[PDB]
Amino acid sequence: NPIIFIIILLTIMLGTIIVMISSHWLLVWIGFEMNMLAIIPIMMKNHNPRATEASTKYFLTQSTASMLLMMAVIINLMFSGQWTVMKLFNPMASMLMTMALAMKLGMAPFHFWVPEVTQGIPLSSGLILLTWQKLAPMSVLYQIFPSINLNLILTLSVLSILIGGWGGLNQTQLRKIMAYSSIAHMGWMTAVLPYNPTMTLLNLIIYIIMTSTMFTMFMANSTTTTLSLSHTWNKTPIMTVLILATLLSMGGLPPLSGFMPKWMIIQEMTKNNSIILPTFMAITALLNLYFYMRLTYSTTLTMFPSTNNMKMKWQFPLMKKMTFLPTMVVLSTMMLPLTPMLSV
Amino acid sequence: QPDVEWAEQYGGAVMYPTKETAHWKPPPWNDVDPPKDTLVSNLTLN
Amino acid sequence: XXXXXXXXXXXXXXXXXXXXXXXXXXXXXXXXXXXXXXXXXXXXXXXXXXXXXXXXXXXXXXXXXXXXXXXXXXXXXXXXXXXXXXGNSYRLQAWLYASRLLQYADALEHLLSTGQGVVLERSIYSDFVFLEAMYRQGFIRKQCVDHYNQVKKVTICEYLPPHVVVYVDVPVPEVQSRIQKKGNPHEMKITSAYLQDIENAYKGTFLPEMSEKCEVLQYSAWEAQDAEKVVEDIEYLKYDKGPWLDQNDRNLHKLRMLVQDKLEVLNYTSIPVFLPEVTVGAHQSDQVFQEFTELPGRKYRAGYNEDVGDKWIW
Amino acid sequence: XXXXXXXXXXXXXXXXXXXXXXXXXXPRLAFVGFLGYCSGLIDNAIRRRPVLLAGLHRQLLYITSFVFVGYYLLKRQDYMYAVRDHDMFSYIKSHXXXXXXXXXXXXXXXXXXX
Amino acid sequence: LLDLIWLEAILPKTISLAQMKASTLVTNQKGLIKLYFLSFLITILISMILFNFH
Amino acid sequence: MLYIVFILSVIFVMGFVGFSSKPSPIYGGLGLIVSGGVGCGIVLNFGGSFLGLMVFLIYLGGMMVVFGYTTAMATEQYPEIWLSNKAVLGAFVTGLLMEFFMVYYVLKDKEVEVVFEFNGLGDWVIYDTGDSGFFSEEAMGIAALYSYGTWLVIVTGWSLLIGVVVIMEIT
Amino acid sequence: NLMLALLTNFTLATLLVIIAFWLPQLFSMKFFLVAITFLLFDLEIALLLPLPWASQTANLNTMLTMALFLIILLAVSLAYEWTQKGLE
Amino acid sequence: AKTVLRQYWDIPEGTECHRKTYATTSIGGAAGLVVSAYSVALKTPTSFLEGVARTGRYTFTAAAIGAIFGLTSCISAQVREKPDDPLNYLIGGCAGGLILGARTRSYGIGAAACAYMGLTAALVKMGQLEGWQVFAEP
Amino acid sequence: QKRLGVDLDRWMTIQSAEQPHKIPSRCHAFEKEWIECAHGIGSIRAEKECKIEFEDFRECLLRQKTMKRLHAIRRQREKLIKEGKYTPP
Amino acid sequence: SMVYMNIMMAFTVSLVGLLMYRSHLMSSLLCLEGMMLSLFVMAALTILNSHFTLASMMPIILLVFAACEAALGLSLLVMVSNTYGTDYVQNLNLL
């Protein structure tokens, strides 16, 4: 992977632009497929028996998913006629459309591939791309948020934090914990879509920055809880303070930036006379915190992972924005109260 | 202080001891190598 | 970001008389060490043999760390009078394997960037011979061997070429008499069973090395100490069927990135698995980290350091 | 308002309406500027360098980048809150029937005991 | 009885039952793409029959 | 005699049953030739000279021919009878009975449907198209043009550059 | 009729098989890369198929820059086939 | 179906409960079939002989919870006055969680979480007033 | 669209547009009604004023209202077996 | 209306075919072709009966992209048979 690897990475960047700037329903289908043909090579890279299994599981669960989207595109020719990504019109078309989006974002009945795909990547650079790919179908949902029946969108949000809040408890694999942290945060994504379109995109701004900081802290190789355990005493001790700060912000805690999306999600929902649904969102949010709480015990507690082998030489990773973005990820509570309006 | 016995509880296996699925072994440190053999390798003709 | 579009590229200005040579597995007595120094007539660079203080030989700044600062309970003289239960035994050998792997990465980095022939004294494909000889006698437990094999499968496979030129020396069974005649008094009075097993394990190490189609030349004690004979034999013999002949664009670029950084190469070397002869105690690790930070060598680390260099603030 | 009706879609800042006047040396800008300095303190924690405060002088790049982006980000904040209020006041003026006024009363309220 | 056991038994009550609910998601379904896709068959039927929407 | 397209639509579903059922990639592969070739007639009857023959050129004479290689490259297992296998015959019989039960309801015009839309008869109303255009006729008569849709040409060319580069890098 | 013309050829073809059947009584994955490139090129041919039938009403200056563009990238895909294809 | 759920709210306005008990079985039965459908993904041994066995234990018990809940609510309504109360459904909620201890010989679990199940069942009829809304638009 | 196109235009997506030839769409008479109704923001968001014009547009593509009408005539013609039935064509 | 009633039923059979798996992996990619074949008939008839002229090019573009997923995803199938013996959905390592 020499110069052309950047070009392969550029087509994912350009692929989302096609989805972003679009008016035609077949144009976004092209935009989704621009990502399909360009993530798989980075999913493989070194060629491993675990990588072959992950890439096939990533393909089959996602290519069939986009094929359900094309049905809803063709129902938009049978009914309502026009090829515009403004409204879905038909309730018959929306049922197949929302489920196709749930296969990438809703996750509540389509989570199954995520913990196996995220674990299957041999490299840390591939972990960023799956948290960046979720930006693409969110642009579609922001365009067609009316007309779609709320009874079978909010079920994809309520159930997702339940399975996300239980699915990380029996996991020691560091990639797997972050895989279920996606599904847990995706419930908050598919909740603001029926109740006020703004702050839904800001939820991405908080999430993507917070997740990109997380994996770049794991540039010093760690794949399990026990491998991230040997970091405070043997490796760099000051580095684990930033891992602590990012993990505390991942769960809902006020002096950190991660509580600031959770503000407006409940605020806009309570304005629409709904109290019984946002209550369930807050109790299930506690279950999300528990995974980060156990993972902060690799940074706070002793835990005895000393080992005979010791590193003396200074570490030099990639670190693209692993210094500027964690400062925004640790503290942005006072910095961003009126910034909800600035995004959209 | 936490010792080596405490680290073995949070060691790479299942986080939570397995109820039914315990046959699944831990993955390798830097991407697992699968089957070296189980291949044809070079054809023979009469 | 890695630059490959620039003038600096793999395979260019290399390969033509730049292949690595290794003189490894030649009993307890250093007989291969003397012949390797004279073998650097055709080769550009020659590397020293790795010991306990081999990783800290260069590392940060000139001088090596003193006793406890480098590794807790690690001495070559201590292994001569080896004691069972609470001591060195295995953790010295695990440090010895990690040190040889680290210097191999830098020698390969010296080979890939600017094509120069580097000769290494005792490679990473020779440490298993040194371990198995001690395993035959009651010194190392069975569980520690499984810890060694787990590191063996991960670290070796990441590096593409083993060695192009291999020199294996098989001496007389009366090699202990030559070791007694040597200047070192601490190295003397070593077990004869361990030295005999080291020659036996080396016989089952040269054959798998030849099975991977690597060029190997055998030399006796009478054939030893020759500069003209060794140089002419390596030059005449052509490299064929070996795994060194790989892809110039894809394979050579990937191996160069792993060898460039010292921390990246030793990242898989540290195992998450706990062992009694591996020092797991965090209480001793906290005191050792405090002393290393207080040391005038690295302290703040990476280029800029107070009361050692200090050129500019920006 | 979320959807554009009068405002132009996809803008660098605003450009359609420029008259608002951005804040000069604001307390809000100082906090973003503090985070720019704070990012230039924890960068030496990642790459081990002597002194977080008195180390490398590439910190000026980190402070300026947070100020420059932050000034544009706060300019949109003042713009979007103005449009939100502008459409709100226009809704009352045009309809009139939706809004009701009530002033001066003498209503009885239940008193609490103990 | 009270100040250490019964008055405490409000949050350990929502830990002992919470960990039982936690084990029914993590250790449940021992791998297999087969099993996860069998569950997706039901999810479409819930949205069509069990929940009245189109 | 009365219907033209309606008979071909039944054979279209008939070939598709060997996909929900699992008759191995050999016999399952044969289904796409049967369903594809008859499937062209469904497209051709309402019009489309170019687009009707594109199925023969790409879907039939390109797509499945590459799939002919992969069956020999991976999982050949010497082709077997798709009747002796358990649950395969059960999936095949239940697959046809979901559609053939609806065929019986076509008689007496109206048929019961899961969807809200009614079927009725529609024989002369099946085409639902007048003469209208004469010279350079049909919407599919000039189906593809490089003009107007200039952006679509660039991205299709870009995506086909990706395929050649990527698949070469995997192997 | 097209249906009557096609079916007559196949029914006579089936009859020739029965004559011989009834009357008398007493590995390598390098091939795959060639097959894939066939499919990927033919799709570029599929986009370049309309040219003689399309260019009749549309403007020539708008088409000229776009028509050649597909063939240029079709040569760039073959230019990637020169940087070590294999022994095939 | 939501039309089945809407029928549940109309009956308790009067006094009749003979048709209310028949309607409660369809609510608990259909909800039990959802959990029964996901249990197929656990890989059932053999075919049909053990496949029905797993579906049988889940659906029959879940329908029993709803059926007793419908019965106990009407007994509590006929005895004494008061049409609808959260205290009235709390007694009925306890009886629904009581039969979970009959599933396995352990006496607890269902009886241990009887107050937990009874409170959650009461919360459903807490939202009969305008104060509680599960899903809202404005 | 989440991000709109500025200056350069690449659309030709919606019904009733500048066609490839001079030939017009089959439903072009009903296509113009839906565009002229929903050109304002407070028409499709409300979706009450354009209810009449959309149903006539729905009648063009699906032809469901005409299909049910022709169904009644064809059934009654079949119902008149061994009875008085009209024949002229 | 009448013709659309059968091909929508043909679409649901091809949809279930994607969601069904028994040992073989090749069926899914065969069903992906069938799904795009059923969508091709549905798209063509709507433009052919209700004339558009400009929009008749859209299924021709759809025909091209149908093969793109059925080749680049099909290429991954061969890579499974290089690592493993034969292609099986039953043969997976990821958890």
Side-chain angles (χ1 to χ4, degrees), chain A residues 1-303 305 317 326 337 340, chain B residues 2 7 11-13 17 22 26-28 34-35 43-46, chain C residues 1-123 125-173 183 185 193 201 204 208 221 224 227 242-243 272 276 281-282 296-297 302-303 309, chain D residues 1-50 54-55 57-114, chain E residues 1-50, chain F residues 1-107 120 122 130 133 139-171, chain G residues 1-24 30-88, chain H, chain I residues 5 17 20 24 27-40 42 46 50-80 84 88-89, chain J:
Chain A
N1 295 282
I3 310 299
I4 47 95
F5 179 76
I6 312 151
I7 313 298
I8 293 153
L9 201 82
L10 200 140
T11 51
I12 314 151
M13 297 282 282
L14 200 141
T16 318
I17 296 161
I18 308 150
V19 191
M20 279 282 284
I21 311 155
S22 58
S23 58
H24 204 267
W25 270 109
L26 204 134
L27 196 79
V28 285
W29 157 260
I30 290 155
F32 278 120
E33 270 211 52
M34 278 285 283
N35 302 309
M36 293 289 177
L37 313 167
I39 294 158
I40 290 164
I42 316 159
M43 281 295 295
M44 295 286 284
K45 282 282 270 184
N46 298 297
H47 178 76
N48 297 290
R50 285 277 175 90
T52 49
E53 290 175 48
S55 55
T56 47
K57 212 171 279 171
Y58 180 76
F59 164 75
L60 291 159
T61 329
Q62 227 174 58
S63 59
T64 56
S66 59
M67 220 145 288
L68 286 154
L69 145 79
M70 188 36 65
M71 176 41 66
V73 167
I74 283 151
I75 307 154
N76 276 46
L77 297 158
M78 281 283 283
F79 294 86
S80 76
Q82 282 193 303
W83 246 323
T84 45
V85 200
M86 273 68 250
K87 278 186 178 182
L88 233 296
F89 298 97
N90 251 51
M92 292 283 179
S94 67
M95 290 284 99
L96 289 149
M97 182 64 201
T98 49
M99 283 273 275
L101 294 150
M103 274 263 201
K104 288 171 187 177
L105 289 166
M107 306 270 84
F110 309 107
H111 72 287
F112 302 100
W113 63 279
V114 188
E116 292 160 310
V117 162
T118 321
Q119 194 203 18
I121 322 152
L123 279 145
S124 59
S125 58
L127 294 159
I128 307 285
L129 288 157
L130 269 159
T131 52
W132 194 87
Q133 184 54 35
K134 287 181 277 282
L135 197 147
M138 278 292 284
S139 298
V140 192
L141 269 155
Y142 186 76
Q143 287 169 63
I144 45 95
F145 72 95
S147 75
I148 45 166
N149 294 303
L150 320 178
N151 293 299
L152 280 146
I153 311 155
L154 279 152
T155 46
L156 309 161
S157 69
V158 166
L159 284 156
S160 56
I161 319 159
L162 286 158
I163 58 151
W166 300 326
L169 273 148
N170 291 298
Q171 286 178 333
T172 42
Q173 295 285 335
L174 191 75
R175 296 165 191 265
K176 278 185 172 179
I177 305 150
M178 284 298 286
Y180 272 95
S181 82
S182 176
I183 308 144
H185 273 268
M186 282 312 106
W188 303 98
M189 299 282 185
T190 44
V192 205
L193 293 157
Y195 307 100
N196 178 51
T198 51
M199 279 294 297
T200 328
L201 288 160
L202 205 137
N203 257 256
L204 289 158
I205 299 159
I206 302 298
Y207 172 81
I208 295 153
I209 289 165
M210 207 164 284
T211 49
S212 63
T213 49
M214 272 292 287
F215 299 122
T216 48
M217 293 314 288
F218 306 134
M219 282 300 286
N221 289 302
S222 54
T223 46
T224 47
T225 45
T226 46
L227 198 55
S228 61
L229 207 81
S230 185
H231 216 98
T232 43
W233 321 112
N234 209 344
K235 278 189 177 181
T236 42
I238 328 150
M239 273 269 282
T240 49
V241 188
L242 283 154
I243 302 158
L244 171 80
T246 45
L247 277 159
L248 283 156
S249 64
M250 280 287 278
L253 289 156
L256 298 131
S257 68
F259 199 81
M260 300 309 287
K262 285 185 179 184
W263 258 82
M264 296 287 177
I265 304 158
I266 302 155
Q267 193 182 297
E268 295 296 306
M269 214 167 289
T270 43
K271 282 181 87 72
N272 294 46
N273 299 303
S274 60
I275 320 103
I276 201 154
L277 203 142
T279 45
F280 204 85
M281 302 287 281
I283 305 156
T284 49
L286 293 149
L287 287 155
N288 304 336
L289 188 82
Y290 203 90
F291 323 129
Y292 317 126
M293 278 297 103
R294 284 192 284 103
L295 205 56
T296 45
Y297 299 151
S298 65
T299 57
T300 49
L301 233 190
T302 48
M303 290 294 284
Chain B
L43 287 154
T44 52
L45 298 167
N46 292 303
Chain C
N88 298 55
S89 187
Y90 178 76
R91 62 175 166 180
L92 178 74
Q93 203 74 244
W95 183 258
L96 206 140
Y97 182 77
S99 61
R100 290 207 203 274
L101 194 83
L102 203 141
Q103 65 163 45
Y104 182 81
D106 284 62
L108 201 82
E109 205 273 301
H110 198 270
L111 203 145
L112 286 152
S113 61
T114 63
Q116 283 184 302
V118 185
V119 179
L120 286 151
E121 290 170 56
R122 295 262 284 273
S123 60
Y125 296 89
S126 187
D127 288 300
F128 69 97
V129 189
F130 207 84
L131 187 91
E132 281 182 297
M134 198 65 76
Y135 177 70
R136 298 281 174 184
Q137 287 84 58
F139 288 96
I140 310 156
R141 211 171 76 257
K142 201 186 177 287
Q143 285 186 303
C144 298
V145 192
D146 288 66
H147 185 88
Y148 188 85
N149 282 113
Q150 281 182 51
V151 185
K152 195 196 271 178
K153 287 172 185 178
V154 175
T155 53
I156 282 157
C157 292
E158 286 183 302
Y159 298 96
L160 288 153
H163 271 284
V164 186
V165 186
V166 186
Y167 272 93
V168 183
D169 294 297
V170 183
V172 286
Chain D
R28 284 178 285 178
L29 280 154
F31 198 85
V32 189
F34 192 83
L35 287 159
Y37 189 79
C38 195
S39 60
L41 286 155
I42 55 100
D43 71 322
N44 295 304
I46 307 145
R47 294 174 189 92
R48 205 194 278 266
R49 291 278 279 266
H57 278 276
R58 61 175 178 178
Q59 291 175 52
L60 281 88
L61 193 138
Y62 273 92
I63 306 151
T64 46
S65 59
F66 267 83
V67 169
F68 187 77
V69 176
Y71 185 78
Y72 272 89
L73 213 143
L74 278 152
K75 198 175 271 180
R76 287 194 195 97
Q77 281 181 43
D78 288 302
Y79 178 75
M80 205 75 180
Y81 268 91
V83 179
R84 194 190 68 88
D85 194 63
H86 189 83
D87 291 304
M88 198 186 79
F89 272 90
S90 298
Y91 189 80
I92 313 153
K93 285 186 181 76
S94 60
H95 289 270
Chain E
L1 283 156
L2 294 140
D3 294 63
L4 285 161
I5 299 94
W6 275 101
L7 291 159
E8 200 180 305
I10 299 153
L11 285 152
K13 200 180 272 286
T14 52
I15 284 158
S16 60
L17 282 158
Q19 283 190 57
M20 192 69 185
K21 284 179 182 178
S23 58
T24 51
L25 289 159
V26 188
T27 55
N28 270 224
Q29 292 152 296
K30 199 180 180 180
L32 312 172
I33 302 156
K34 182 199 276 178
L35 290 168
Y36 310 134
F37 273 73
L38 279 157
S39 67
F40 303 150
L41 279 151
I42 316 144
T43 57
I44 315 155
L45 298 162
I46 300 154
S47 61
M48 287 289 283
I49 311 151
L50 278 146
Chain F
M1 201 74 77
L2 284 147
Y3 298 95
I4 310 149
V5 198
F6 191 76
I7 316 160
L8 300 162
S9 61
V10 182
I11 319 153
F12 189 82
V13 185
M14 190 72 179
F16 261 87
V17 198
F19 289 94
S20 183
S21 187
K22 208 145 187 160
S24 299
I26 302 300
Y27 282 87
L30 277 152
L32 272 158
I33 297 104
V34 183
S35 60
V38 175
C40 297
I42 306 156
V43 187
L44 281 154
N45 277 321
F46 305 105
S49 59
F50 186 80
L51 206 137
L53 287 156
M54 285 287 276
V55 195
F56 260 109
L57 293 159
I58 293 94
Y59 276 92
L60 290 160
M63 271 262 269
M64 260 300 303
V65 201
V66 171
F67 268 65
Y69 274 90
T70 54
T71 45
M73 290 287 101
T75 54
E76 50 96 54
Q77 285 185 301
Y78 43 90
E80 57 184 295
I81 316 151
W82 62 287
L83 292 154
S84 187
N85 293 60
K86 208 263 275 179
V88 176
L89 201 142
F92 185 78
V93 71
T94 48
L96 57 91
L97 276 163
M98 280 287 282
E99 207 274 299
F100 271 91
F101 202 83
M102 202 179 78
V103 178
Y104 197 82
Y105 274 88
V106 182
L107 296 158
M140 218 156 280
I142 312 150
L145 277 174
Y146 301 95
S147 60
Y148 303 97
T150 50
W151 181 251
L152 290 149
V153 188
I154 315 153
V155 194
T156 44
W158 257 103
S159 61
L160 283 152
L161 280 164
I162 296 156
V164 187
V165 170
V166 166
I167 296 159
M168 277 285 283
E169 276 212 302
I170 304 157
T171 51
Chain G
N1 291 295
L2 285 157
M3 289 289 284
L4 195 81
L6 284 155
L7 285 163
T8 40
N9 287 285
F10 280 88
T11 45
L12 285 162
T14 51
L15 207 141
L16 293 156
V17 185
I18 314 153
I19 292 157
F21 201 86
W22 191 82
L23 279 162
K30 286 174 183 176
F31 290 92
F32 178 70
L33 285 157
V34 179
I36 285 299
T37 46
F38 156 79
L39 185 138
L40 289 161
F41 291 162
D42 274 50
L43 298 162
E44 291 203 62
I45 269 93
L47 290 158
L48 288 161
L49 263 163
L51 280 160
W53 150 78
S55 61
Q56 278 184 305
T57 49
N59 296 300
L60 294 160
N61 283 343
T62 49
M63 198 188 281
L64 168 71
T65 326
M66 301 310 296
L68 303 162
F69 192 76
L70 284 159
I71 323 156
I72 295 154
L73 307 180
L74 188 47
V76 174
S77 57
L78 283 157
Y80 202 83
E81 290 286 87
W82 274 312
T83 171
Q84 201 78 287
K85 194 184 177 181
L87 294 161
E88 188 71 62
Chain H
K2 287 186 90 73
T3 49
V4 188
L5 287 154
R6 280 191 178 271
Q7 284 185 305
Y8 183 77
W9 292 88
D10 293 305
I11 319 155
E13 287 181 300
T15 47
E16 202 177 61
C17 281
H18 295 271
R19 204 69 69 185
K20 199 187 177 182
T21 51
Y22 192 82
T24 46
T25 49
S26 62
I27 308 153
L33 283 152
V34 183
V35 189
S36 186
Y38 277 90
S39 62
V40 190
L42 269 151
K43 282 180 87 74
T44 52
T46 60
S47 59
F48 293 93
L49 287 152
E50 204 73 60
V52 179
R54 266 203 170 96
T55 60
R57 57 168 71 187
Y58 273 90
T59 53
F60 200 84
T61 49
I65 300 153
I68 295 158
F69 191 81
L71 279 154
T72 48
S73 182
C74 293
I75 300 155
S76 61
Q78 284 181 303
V79 179
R80 86 177 184 267
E81 219 179 60
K82 294 172 184 177
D84 287 295
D85 276 294
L87 195 80
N88 198 71
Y89 277 86
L90 206 143
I91 315 151
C94 284
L98 195 80
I99 55 148
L100 275 85
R103 197 180 178 179
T104 178
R105 192 92 278 106
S106 58
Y107 109 90
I109 312 157
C114 187
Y116 203 87
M117 196 71 183
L119 198 81
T120 49
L123 278 154
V124 188
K125 280 278 153 73
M126 273 281 195
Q128 61 180 56
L129 294 154
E130 287 178 299
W132 299 106
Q133 280 185 303
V134 197
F135 304 102
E137 291 188 302
Chain I
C27 285
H28 199 272
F30 293 95
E31 280 174 352
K32 280 183 84 73
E33 285 179 296
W34 182 239
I35 300 159
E36 282 181 58
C37 205
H39 76 283
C50 299
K51 278 185 174 180
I52 315 150
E53 289 166 65
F54 189 77
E55 281 180 297
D56 285 293
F57 179 78
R58 196 180 274 262
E59 199 188 297
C60 192
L61 284 95
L62 289 155
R63 289 278 179 95
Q64 288 288 305
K65 284 181 177 285
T66 51
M67 207 74 76
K68 287 183 274 288
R69 200 184 185 181
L70 286 155
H71 177 79
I73 309 155
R74 206 184 180 269
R75 187 182 274 189
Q76 281 182 301
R77 199 172 74 93
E78 283 178 298
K79 275 175 86 73
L80 291 157
Chain J
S1 60
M2 191 71 185
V3 195
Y4 300 102
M5 297 286 281
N6 295 299
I7 45 173
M8 270 286 283
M9 198 71 182
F11 182 81
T12 49
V13 176
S14 61
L15 213 163
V16 171
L18 300 163
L19 308 168
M20 282 281 282
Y21 289 100
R22 279 212 173 193
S23 75
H24 278 269
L25 186 65
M26 252 296 290
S27 73
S28 60
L29 282 152
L30 288 155
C31 285
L32 282 160
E33 292 192 300
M35 275 276 287
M36 288 308 292
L37 192 85
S38 60
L39 286 163
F40 195 83
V41 181
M42 280 211 75
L45 263 69
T46 49
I47 306 157
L48 196 48
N49 296 309
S50 302
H51 301 276
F52 261 87
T53 325
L54 297 154
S56 52
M57 200 187 180
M58 308 303 105
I60 304 155
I61 304 152
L62 187 77
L63 172 141
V64 179
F65 275 92
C68 289
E69 285 182 312
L72 208 134
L74 186 75
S75 61
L76 293 160
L77 187 98
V78 185
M79 308 311 288
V80 183
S81 64
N82 283 119
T83 52
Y84 295 95
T86 38
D87 277 69
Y88 279 95
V89 199
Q90 205 175 108
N91 204 342
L92 281 156
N93 199 279
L94 282 163
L95 265 286

